[PDB]
Hints:
heterotetramer, A: Globin-like, C: mainly alpha, 7 helices, binds protoporphyrin IX containing FE, binds cyanide ion, heme (chains A, B), metal-binding (chains A, B), Globin-like_sf (chains A, B)
Amino acid sequence: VQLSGEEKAAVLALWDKVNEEEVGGEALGRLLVVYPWTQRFFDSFGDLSNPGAVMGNPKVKAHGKKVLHSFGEGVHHLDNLKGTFAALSELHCDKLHVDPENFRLLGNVLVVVLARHFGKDFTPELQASYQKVVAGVANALAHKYH
Amino acid sequence: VQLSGEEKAAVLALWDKVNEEEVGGEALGRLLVVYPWTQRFFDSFGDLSNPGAVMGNPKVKAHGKKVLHSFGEGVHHLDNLKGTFAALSELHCDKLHVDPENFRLLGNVLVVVLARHFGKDFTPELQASYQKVVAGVANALAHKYH
Amino acid sequence: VLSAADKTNVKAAWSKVGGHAGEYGAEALERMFLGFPTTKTYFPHFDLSHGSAQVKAHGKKVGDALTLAVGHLDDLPGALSNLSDLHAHKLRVDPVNFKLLSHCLLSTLAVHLPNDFTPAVHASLDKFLSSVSTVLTSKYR
Amino acid sequence: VLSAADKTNVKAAWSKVGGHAGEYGAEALERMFLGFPTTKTYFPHFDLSHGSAQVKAHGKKVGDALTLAVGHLDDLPGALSNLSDLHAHKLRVDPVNFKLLSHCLLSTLAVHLPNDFTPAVHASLDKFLSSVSTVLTSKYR
Ligand code: HEM
Ligand code: HEM
Ligand code: HEM
Ligand code: HEM
Ligand SMILES: [C-]#N
Ligand SMILES: [C-]#N
Ligand SMILES: [C-]#N
Ligand SMILES: [C-]#N
């Protein structure tokens, strides 16, 4: 993505403070509650009938950590997102059959969660950089679809 | 795009029969009628208040021909769509500020028009190939946005 | 939800489809499965080959639900109440898929009724399919 | 359009926003202009710099229209009739933009009301902003 040197520094300084477990469990939990059709992909996780069951579900937290850990890898590799997410793009496309539109949704949920956790420090300028970031990951994941 | 050798031949044999003027004027005309917000981008064209004015407008036909001529260039260059639409991607992004979502819309309108013109010859198999095609052009045009 | 003008074009266009609604429903499904492969994941129990008796039988139900909707443009949420439960609650169909099937329905109509498929009718049928789609995904809202 | 449960969360959440609706409206606009630059094309007559008196004055109107909507969740098309004419007829706002401003409104609320911004409230406000957005683009349907 097209990020100056001052943006890349701000984006990276924030990730130093991101707890992948806490933020990861929350982002995935909110995607499942706010956009219910996404639950279809995670039946094996058990009960996800209400917001309480979902947010407290151990498999949801564990999986959310995995997602954010790969997100962090993209952040530290903004010059080659398509190479970092190549295998994952095939996984979600060929095997899971997730419509790429949902990658944009999870990307935006993550941003809302970062906002919730960082408050005033998540400035309009910093959010703008993170939107380019989540968009670049979303695109790298949709790559193997066309 | 990922098109076999039998698909590429079918896609190309059909374009031999496409009148860029007739199909081009119709596709652009229907985009403007069916998705009214797109009219905003073509104020200079004059009156586009109703479906009759739009379809008969000379600037709409002339412009539609231009769009389809560039579409035809993409068809004959399916191995390097991003290079063929590089300048156009900058035009629509930097200057016009067209949201990439509208590229998908025009792509689908074109398909409906091809269906209308070719009837039974526009088989479900042939349409599937054309969906990969319009999607690949849409992606090449959105390139300069991220 | 639709304008009086739109309702008139919709009922008129559907009167020309007449008794082919089932056939167009089956064809639209085929065009969707081939053009947008991800949608096939919702029909693992179906034989999805061309001429499949199942998708023909299924296209008949789809066609019949749309004829029902046209005869009830003033109260779609009510007339389609059960389909909305089936699609959003039980199957959890991704909203994006409703746009794909709508595009394939319009494509099918354009093939079969080229002279009737005018710009004005096209715009009304698009609004009609958008309305039905909203009703069927209403449990997400 | 919304469930009774959703209406309750929406009125409750907005009561916590209280008198900051104008401020959050201005902040949400700023986050939108910076994060999604294409949207700035609709405001060529505005000074879009941080602290701009114009976007502050504008954010107040946006905030006030949302407070109006919350006090009329049972009849949005009526209460927002004039805004729908302005946005779809006169300005011809691309529907995609309503999703961008909604995301920035939720982002702003999350910054300012972290404890109140629970998963359940988040889901209801999303449905609320989706409903308002549908009403404002209704002239395309
Ligand atoms: C930014 C977007 C995303 C990222 C970075 C991401 C990342 C990942 C990662 C790292 C895995 C584990 C792969 C492995 O262990 O080999 C995974 C698996 C999975 N993802 Fe995603 N994902 C994304 C979006 C989505 C979305 C939107 C959905 C569905 C709505 C989805 C559904 C799944 C499922 C069902 C699995 C398999 C889970 C299992 O182990 O049962 N992903 N994803
Ligand atoms: C598949 C998608 C598209 C293709 C292949 C395409 C192609 C073109 C081409 C060839 C030109 C002329 C460039 C030149 O003469 O240098 C052009 C200009 C333009 N395009 Fe597109 N376009 C696409 C989609 C769109 C969409 C969706 C919109 C707006 C909703 C749009 C708005 C315009 C406008 C306003 C102009 C300038 C017209 C003028 O001369 O006043 N284009 N496009
Ligand atoms: C205009 C939009 C649609 C209409 C009118 C429609 C109508 C119907 C009808 C009438 C049924 C039959 C239920 C029964 O037999 O009781 C059905 C079932 C079903 N629909 Fe839809 N549908 C629509 C869109 C979709 C989409 C976009 C998908 C997914 C891509 C989908 C997937 C299914 C599935 C999987 C079933 C159950 C099939 C079976 O097991 O027999 N539908 N739909
Ligand atoms: C929740 C969604 C929205 C709400 C509640 C809303 C509300 C309003 C209100 C209350 C006004 C003032 C009209 C007046 O002063 O009479 C307005 C004007 C306007 N809105 Fe929106 N709006 C929304 C979304 C959008 C979006 C997405 C765009 C474009 C990105 C947009 C662009 C405009 C413009 C250009 C004006 C006229 C500004 C001026 O010239 O003073 N609005 N809107
Ligand atoms: C993937 N979560
Ligand atoms: C561009 N039309
Ligand atoms: C449902 N087809
Ligand atoms: C409108 N802002």
